[PDB]
Amino acid sequence: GSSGSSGQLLTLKIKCSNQPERQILEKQLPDSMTVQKVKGLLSRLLKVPVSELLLSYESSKMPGREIELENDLQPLQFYSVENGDCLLVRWSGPSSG
């Protein structure tokens, strides 16, 4: 790709919230990337629609607490997400409301 200076790539770990058994992987993405893109990238992987793809990162400073990213147009840096953090991919099937 480009790999320019603008925006740096963070190193986090992806782990399905509903599928704990599923081994953990590591993906490097530019803090600039919009939560939306991250969801669309995995959408084709887990065959899940970016809509049902609820991304939630765990802030080290505040353990035992996850932040459900509702805004997609917002980058990763917007949620104070820095290398080392943990990525949680959660999705629901049967709608309710």
What does the domain layout of the chain look like in residue ranges? Answer: 1-97
For the chain, the 3-state helix, strand and coil shares in percent, each to the nearest 5, are 10, 30, 60
Phi, psi of 9 (to 5 degrees): -90, 130
Tokens of 37: 């893109």
User: 1-97: what fold?
Assistant: Ubiquitin-like (UB roll) (3.10.20)
Distance separating alpha carbons of residues 21 and 4, to the nearest angstrom:
36
User: Which residues neighbour 62 within 8 Å (Cβ) at sequence distance 6 or greater?
Assistant: none
β-pair type (9-16, 54-58): unpaired
Distance separating alpha carbons of residues 93 and 87, to the nearest angstrom:
20
* Type and span of the H or E element at 11: strand 9-16
Technique that determined the structure? NMR
Tokens of 22: 């599923």
Return the closest-CA partner of residue 31 out of 90, 67, 70, 85: 85
Distance separating alpha carbons of residues 53 and 36, to the nearest angstrom:
9
Distance separating alpha carbons of residues 56 and 27, to the nearest angstrom:
15
